[PDB]
Design a protein around this ligand. Sequence first.
Ligand code: CL
Ligand code: CL
Ligand code: CL
Ligand code: MG
Length: 365
Amino acid sequence: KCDVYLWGAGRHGQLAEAGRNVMVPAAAPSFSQAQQVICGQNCTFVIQANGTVLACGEGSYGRLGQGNSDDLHVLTVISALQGFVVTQLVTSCGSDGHSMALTESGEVFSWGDGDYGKLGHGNSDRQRRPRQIEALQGEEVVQMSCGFKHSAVVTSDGKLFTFGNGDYGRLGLGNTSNKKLPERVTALEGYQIGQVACGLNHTLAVSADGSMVWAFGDGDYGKLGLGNSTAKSSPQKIDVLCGIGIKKVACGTQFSVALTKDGHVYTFGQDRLIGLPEGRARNHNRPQQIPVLAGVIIEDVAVGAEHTLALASNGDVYAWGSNSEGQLGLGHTNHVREPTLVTGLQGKNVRQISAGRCHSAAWTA
Ligand SMILES: [Cl-]
Ligand SMILES: [Cl-]
Ligand SMILES: [Cl-]
Ligand SMILES: [Mg+2]
């Protein structure tokens, strides 16, 4: 067992017994068998240590993978993945919602809203239960991301595939067509891609050795980190992030986050969401280190739609950004510009975090 804390919006039952509108982290005893918790678009998934997946919250457009679209207020097993050991799960933080789960054998199952081909089945049909993406048969997928209207997967041999809505270049294929089947990002074929993150309408990718980062998609608010606000349909190196050793990247609606291996956080994009003091908004269109976290070793970051959580090596959790539903966990619903300590998690020995559209989670597994 572990301890799980949930907070933010809970009106569709996505926080189960923790409540309906929660401004401070609240214990969720029913989640105690979680090894992972994944917060999405008004929904929450759990992966148990044995590979079983459960879901609760908003069920619109098959979100919960139950074979129907019912809202659920208690964690409920996704029977359609029974038989498979699920190791990872990702879900979108906006639009009409979709999800991808990864098995032990490197196979990817997708479900939810089918618009734009983002599920990868060669059509745009809703899938109310998890369905294997057959086109990835024989690929060993190791990492995945769900954007608002597109998706992406990374393979063990370092290839990157994208699919879904093509508007503004977000698939990185050099045009803006929608793709209903996974497409190799040929521009990156000469490199080994280790991870991908997808936002409202841009995408970031990191090389396997952490030495290189690329951006593509819509350019608003300088969220591509290339020093302007122009959309790019092919991957473009983010020079500031190359050579510094990147552990992880993540994307929100109008901003990007990068974590270095030595525990520093860089942000870029819309000023209100990037956690910097106001003077530093000058260069919001290039990556900048977050000053208030300089004396903190950050082990992980989790990005929702418009908020960010950061976990320090001592277990402390920091939050900043939008907060109208209490998703920061700070006891109010006011916007917070810079990373702020979540005091409700002090002494809780948090080891993992997750951020959804407008709810959050932290737990001790
Ligand atoms: Cl399996
Ligand atoms: Cl290929
Ligand atoms: Cl490096
Ligand atoms: Mg634009």
